[PDB]
Amino acid sequence: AVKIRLKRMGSKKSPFYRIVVADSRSPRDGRFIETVGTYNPLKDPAEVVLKEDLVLDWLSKGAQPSDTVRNILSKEGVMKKHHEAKN
Amino acid sequence: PTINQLVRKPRKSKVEKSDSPALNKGYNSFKKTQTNVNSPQKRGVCTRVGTMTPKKPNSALRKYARVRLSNLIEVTAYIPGIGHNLQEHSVVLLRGGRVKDLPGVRYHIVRGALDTAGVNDRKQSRSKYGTKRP
Amino acid sequence: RNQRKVYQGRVVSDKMDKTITVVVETKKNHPIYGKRMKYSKKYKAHDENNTAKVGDIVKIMETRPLSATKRFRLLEVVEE
Amino acid sequence: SRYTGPSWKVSRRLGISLSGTGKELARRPYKPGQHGPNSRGKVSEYGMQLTEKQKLRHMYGMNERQFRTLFIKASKIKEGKHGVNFMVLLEQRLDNVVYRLGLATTRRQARQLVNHGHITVDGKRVDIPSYHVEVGQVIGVREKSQNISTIKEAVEATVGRPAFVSFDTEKLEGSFTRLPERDELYPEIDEALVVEYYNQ
Amino acid sequence: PNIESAIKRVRTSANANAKNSSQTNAMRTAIKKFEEAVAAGADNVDALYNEAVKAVDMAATKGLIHKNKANRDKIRLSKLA
RNA sequence: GAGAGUUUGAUCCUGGCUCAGGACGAACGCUGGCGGCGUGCCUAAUACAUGCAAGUCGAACGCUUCUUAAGAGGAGUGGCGGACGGGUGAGUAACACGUGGGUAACCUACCCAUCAGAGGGGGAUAACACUUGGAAACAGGUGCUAAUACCGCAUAACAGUUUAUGCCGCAUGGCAUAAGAGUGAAAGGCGCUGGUGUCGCUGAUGGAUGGACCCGCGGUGCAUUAGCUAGUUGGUGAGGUAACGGCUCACCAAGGCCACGAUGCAUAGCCGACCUGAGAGGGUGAUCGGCCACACUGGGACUGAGACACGGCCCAGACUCCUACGGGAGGCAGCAGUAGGGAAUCUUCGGCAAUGGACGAAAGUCUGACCGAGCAACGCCGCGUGAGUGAAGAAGGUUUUCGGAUCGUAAAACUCUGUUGUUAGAGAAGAACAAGGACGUUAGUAACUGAACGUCCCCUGACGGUAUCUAACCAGAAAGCCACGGCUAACUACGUGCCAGCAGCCGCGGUAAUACGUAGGUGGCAAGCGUUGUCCGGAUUUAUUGGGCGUAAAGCGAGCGCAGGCGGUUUCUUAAGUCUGAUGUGAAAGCCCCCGGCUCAACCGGGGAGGGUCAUUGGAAACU
Ligand SMILES: [K+]
Ligand SMILES: [K+]
Ligand SMILES: [K+]
Ligand SMILES: [K+]
Ligand SMILES: [K+]
Ligand SMILES: [K+]
Ligand SMILES: [K+]
Ligand SMILES: [K+]
Ligand SMILES: [K+]
Ligand SMILES: [K+]
Ligand SMILES: [K+]
Ligand SMILES: [K+]
Ligand SMILES: [K+]
Ligand SMILES: [K+]
Ligand SMILES: [K+]
Ligand SMILES: [Mg+2]
Ligand SMILES: [Mg+2]
Ligand SMILES: [Mg+2]
Ligand SMILES: [Mg+2]
Ligand SMILES: [Mg+2]
Ligand SMILES: [Mg+2]
Ligand SMILES: [Mg+2]
Ligand SMILES: [Mg+2]
Ligand SMILES: [Mg+2]
Ligand SMILES: [Mg+2]
Ligand SMILES: [Mg+2]
Ligand SMILES: [Mg+2]
Known part of the structure; x- marks a missing residue:
């Protein structure tokens, strides 16, 4: 299925992540449909940059966030917006 | 040439050839064919060890060895330095490089590699001739 | 609605029934020397009633494969 | 790596005083070696260019590889003369910044201070002598290290601060007010020859 | 394995x-x-026609043949009938 | 967009050779302190010991063994996964790939949303119980046994198809409405109170994703490879496929490709990219990303939404292994590792803590993907191997014109520092979670639990006591390599005597060698240095940009000539080329520009730009 998940980048022991829309079958760092945000856990308040409109459109289209992306979208309130849209 | 002539028969640059061809071809025992592999050095066995006479300007007894390489090609290689321990059936390593004096010698036998002992008493440019720092 | 590629050409073979061979006759610059060269590409187009003859200027629109080589449909006979 | 051999010998080979005192050249101002005292033949154009390049890199105590990379950075700079920009970057090097402020008598001494961490930038330890110091940054001695005879003697002895530096003795803190100018740098060194050398 | x-x-x-x-x-x-x-040209042609269509649909179910395959077969049978 | 050396007694020209620059998945030789990041079978797609690399679900089902009726096990059946992820590039010169389009000729499990259904029965069979054969592998026999396993019947046509209308396109035709004829399904589990939440089940539709096919254009050598083709080219039917189609078959014709290079041969995965270059170009296709093909060799199909399936099946073949000799078993181009080949490439390591993936309601199980650690100076970057003072200049080396000169402020001596090193203490971020427990809001209910959403409590680190921080002690443990005749920065003494030997090119050595060996000095670079190998440059040395042919290489001995190339002036017209506006695209990462983050740098991250002889559409008509 279509997944919204973290593609790891950066260097050894210095992780960074791009929140990207990708098919669940594709490799973690390989083919992906589209990038939607970034996520740097090394900052005390994990820094997140997000394309909320793109995320909401994909969620409506049926994209399934991973667990960490679900936490990220909850903290950004995107999950609440999607919930309201479903209602 | 006219532009139309060039279209009909385009330019073709000369083909360049290595100065040490024996190092550019490997061997495959299974298929018993030669491969195209670029190697910095190649191992061989001394089929004959002796001396050679230089070209006209020079006169000496230049020490050489006829070596069959790992790819089954026989070549002639020079033995740099003063004195050596090489006999026939000795396993040696060959590097590229011509010897201007000798007619058909294109390779040097690396000193300090495999059976080739370094040059005794060498103290300057020791990395060449393969002698340990004393 | 999406458009299918259409080509203008000259018929060069009609001995085959229900079909024709068309030629495009373009010119392209030689990649190295830049001289304009006569480039000829020919397609096998489907004629419903063998209306077109040899040496006729016609138009053909690409279609689903109609045979082993056919990929085009005859549209008009611009000249005879 | 870091050169550690004699300093006078390097300076007299270059024919100019790296320390700026002229002390090395004062006695025996020949090139080093047994062939020094006797005259030597004239040098070729390649030799002249090499000598100027060596002057710069030995002045700032750098290795050739890092020196070449720094030269390319100066090239990437758009405005002003390429050689002048290159020398300006050489000054902005942290070792020379400390030396200009006068916390050390010699660039070797300044380099050792920086490497051992006695120097701080804006209150933050920086052990990299190669560190690029920008205009306005505050270079200061580590609090623990401020009470060391070495830097104490160096500061009190150093009298002349270049116009482009501003220094405070009590705090042992200095900073570049502006970039050095061509004249403020060493005028003996011809940067054009070095530019041509690396232009090859 | x-x-x-x-x-x-x-x-x-x-x-x-x-x-x-x-x-x-x-x-x-x-x-x-x-x-x-x-x-x-038998007499139970219609009964056999319905049974053939019934069998084709029941084969489509259970995933023996693709839906397009079943539709083509039914069209073929109808033209025969 | 730099040149230099070398033909000669000297010169100009022509011309080759060689060098100065840069690059590496490099190897070798001498040497070697540390850290960050990255890279590491290029050869034999050679053969592989051993270990692991794909399982999961008890909330689908029935059994079976133990723990004081529990939970923990065991194998069944059944569902999903196994077609992903990982590896290699052998084959392939081809719609394989790149780019730009088309499909009104297509399919799509899981995921989202919508509309419907979810009724009734039936017969089995593993497991199990015995029982035959055997070392086991495993093969059987009989007798039962359940299901979300299987099969019928019932209803469902919104699916498809046919007709009639209406609208529309690009020829076939597309869409909408109505009718009509034939037929098609399912399964229950968990939990609340016949009703019901939720996970499942069946039909149809749309979306998303993935896949399939067709097409324009582009990227190898050879003519000492010129003809090739016979389901071949087309048509008519039939069958087949998800689908169009010689995809297949029967008939009908004789067509089709080819000097715009077919065919054959040789070589080759293609690309983003990477090295080089002023650019045009030349070379490469490692690492990373996309696509493709392959899974011991060859062939075939089964299951499935999806394979003609790396760790599945059948057959054949080559090879290997275990046997009680009866009979069995296997495929590292998965991670390590072994042997072999080679100049040459690593540990038979820790963990699922993070990201991702399979199953499951979930805890959670699995995950040699992936995170880490290990080994190699293999590469790039960073820091050291000490700092200040220190003599008309100690001794010792070297050399002296015996005065001295040089190694040399170098050392010694004095005064400092601890990056590093050792010793001790302190010590992370990476962790977000999920589950679980509290509550609260929306939609639904008759009501609940529950669904979704929101705030709290709690929970978890292999790396690892790692990075990092603090304090104390010691200049103490930490510098080699090449070169010094010209090119080319660097010179003397001995030894040697065309010998030994050196040499990238020119060229040195024949008893006074700055060219050989050593020593002393000096130059270049530095934990590296040098040699070899390969690629681009210089090389205008294949000259499109950008060369030539009287004597340097180069005009066919001459003509006649098909094809092709080129073509006098001018009116109109067309728009193939040509030029141009707008628009779509040229993925991400990478180069380059800006801005941040790592003590700096490498490196990492953010934002741009560029990149096409790209494609659609709209224009102009001077030139061809
Ligand atoms: K000569
Ligand atoms: K020349
Ligand atoms: K199973
Ligand atoms: K499956
Ligand atoms: K294409
Ligand atoms: K046909
Ligand atoms: K290949
Ligand atoms: K195969
Ligand atoms: K498998
Ligand atoms: K995990
Ligand atoms: K396992
Ligand atoms: K020389
Ligand atoms: K030309
Ligand atoms: K003539
Ligand atoms: K035109
Ligand atoms: Mg955090
Ligand atoms: Mg370094
Ligand atoms: Mg390989
Ligand atoms: Mg190949
Ligand atoms: Mg069932
Ligand atoms: Mg050029
Ligand atoms: Mg395997
Ligand atoms: Mg320390
Ligand atoms: Mg010189
Ligand atoms: Mg010598
Ligand atoms: Mg060229
Ligand atoms: Mg001639």
Whole structure:
């Protein structure tokens, strides 16, 4: 299925992540449909940059966030917006 | 040439050839064919060890060895330095490089590699001739 | 609605029934020397009633494969 | 790596005083070696260019590889003369910044201070002598290290601060007010020859 | 096989193949009876027609033949009838 | 967009050779302190010991063994996964790939949303119980046994198809409405109170994703490879496919490709990219990303939404292994590792803590993907191997014109520092979670639990006591390599005597060698240095940009000539080329520009730009 998940980048022991829309079958760092945000856990308040409109459109289209992306979208309130849209 | 002539028969640059061809071809025992592999050095066995006479300007007894390489090609290689321990059936390593004096010698036998002992008493440019720092 | 590629050409073979061979006759610059060269590409187009003859200027629109080589449909006979 | 051999010998080979005192050249101002005292033949154009390049890199105590990379950075700079920009970057090097402020008598001494961490930038330890110091940054001695005879003697002895530096003795803190100018740098060194050398 | 799951799939695929081939042959026999009856001009042609269509649809179900395959077969049978 | 050396007694020209620059998945030789990041079978797609690399679900089902009726096990059946992820590039000169389009000729499990259904029965069979054969592998026999396993019947046509209308396109035709004829399904589990939440089940539709096919254009050598083709080219039917189609078959014709290079041969995965270059170009296709093909060799199909399936099946073949000799078993181009080949490439390591993936309601299980650690100076970057003072200049080396000169402020001596090193203490971020427990809001209910959403409590680190921080002790443990005749920065003494030997090119050595060996000095670079190998440059040395042919290499001995190339002036017209506006695209990462983050740098991250002889559409008509 279509997944919204973290593609790891950066260097050894210095992780960074791009929140990207990708098919669940594709490799973690390989083919992906589209990038939607970034996520740097090394900052005390994990820094997140997000394309909320793109995320909401994909969620409506049926994209399934991973667990960490679900936490990220909850903290950004995107999950609440999607919930309201479903209602 | 006219532009139309060039279209009909385009330019073709000369083909360049290595100065040490024996190092550019490997061997495959299974298929018993030669491969195209670029190697910095190649191992061989001394089929004959002796001396050679230089070209006209020079006169000496230049020490050489006829070596069959790992790819089954026989070549002639020079033995740099003063004195050596090489006999026939000795396993040696060959590097590229011509010897201007000798007619058909294109390779040097690396000193300090495999059976080739370094040059005794060498103290300057020791990395060449393969002698340990004393 | 999406458009299918259409080509203008000259018929060069009609001995085959229900079909024709068309030629495009373009010119392209030689990649190295830049001289304009006569480039000829020919397609096998489907004629419903063998209306077109040899040496006729016609138009053909690409279609689903109609045979082993056919990929085009005859549209008009611009000249005879 | 870091050169550690004699300093006078390097300076007299270059024919100019790296320390700026002229002390090395004062006695025996020949090139080093047994062939020094006797005259030597004239040098070729390649030799002249090499000598100027060596002057710069030995002045700032750098290795050739890092020196070449720094030269390319100066090239990437758009405005002003390429050689002048290159020398300006050489000054902005942290070792020379400390030396200009006068916390050390010699660039070797300044380099050792920086490497051992006695120097701080804006209150933050920086052990990299190669560190690029920008205009306005505050270079200061580590609090623990401020009470060391070495830097104490160096500061009190150093009298002349270049116009482009501003220094405070009590705090042992200095900073570049502006970039050095061509004249403020060493005028003996011809940067054009070095530019041509690396232009090859 | 070297994997327990691989061995299990061998058994299940064998059983499924037996069942699928049996049912597919049943559908083919139904169509075969209808076509022979059509050629002979028999009297139960309509009954055999309905049974052939019924068999084709039941084969489409259970995933013996693709839906397009079933639709083409039904069109073929209708033109024959 | 730099040149230099070398033909000669000297010169100009022509011309080759060689060098100065840069690059590496490099190897070798001498040497070697540390850290960050990255890279590491290029050869034999050679053969592989051993270990692991794909399982999961008890909330689908029935059994079976133990723990004081529990939970923990065991194998069944059944569902999903196994077609992903990982590896290699052998094959392939081809719609394989790149780019730009087309499909009104297509399919799509899981995921989202919508509309419907979810009724009734039936017969089995593993497991199990015995029982035959055997070392086991495993093969059977009989007798039962359940299901979300299987099969019928019932209803469902919104699916498809046919007709009639209406609208529309690009020829076939597309969409909408109505009718009509034939037929098609399912399964229950968990939990609340016959009703019901939720996970499942069946039909149809749309979306998303993935896949399939067709087409324009582009990227190898050879003519000492010129003809090739016979389901071949087309048509008519039939069958087949998800789908169009010689995809297949029967008939009908004789067509089709080819100097715009077919065919054959040789070589080759293609690309983003990477090295080089002023650019045009030349070379490469490692690492990373996309696509493709392959899974011991060859062939075939089964299951499935999806394979003609790396760790599945059948057959054949080559090879290997275990046997009680009866009979069995296997495929590292998965991670390590072994042997072999080679100049040459690593540990048979820790963990699922993070990201991702399979199953499951979930805890959670699995995950040699992936995170880490290990080994190699293999590469790039960073820091050291001490700092200040220190003599008309100690001794010792070297050399002296015996005065001295040089190694040399170098050392010694004095005064400092601890990056590093050792010793001790302190010590992370990476962790977000999920589950679980509290509550609260929306939609639904008759009501609940529950669904979704929101705030709290709690929970978890292999790396690892790692990075990092603090304090104390010691200049103490930490510098080699090449070169010094010209090119080319660097010179003397001995030894040697065309010998030994050196040499990239020119060229040195024949008893006074700055060219050989050593020593002393000096130059270049530095934990590296040098040699070899390969690629681009210089090389205008294949000259499109950008060369030539009287004597340097180069005009066919001459003509006649098909094809092709080129073509006098001018009116109108067309728009193939040509030029141009707008628009779509040229993925991400990478180069380059800006801005941040790592003590700096490498490196990492953010934002741009560029990149096409790209494609659609709209224009102009000077030139061809
Ligand atoms: K199973
Ligand atoms: K000469
Ligand atoms: K020349
Ligand atoms: K499956
Ligand atoms: K294409
Ligand atoms: K046909
Ligand atoms: K290949
Ligand atoms: K194969
Ligand atoms: K498998
Ligand atoms: K995990
Ligand atoms: K396991
Ligand atoms: K020389
Ligand atoms: K030209
Ligand atoms: K003539
Ligand atoms: K035009
Ligand atoms: Mg955090
Ligand atoms: Mg370094
Ligand atoms: Mg390989
Ligand atoms: Mg190949
Ligand atoms: Mg069922
Ligand atoms: Mg050029
Ligand atoms: Mg395997
Ligand atoms: Mg320390
Ligand atoms: Mg010189
Ligand atoms: Mg010498
Ligand atoms: Mg060229
Ligand atoms: Mg001539």
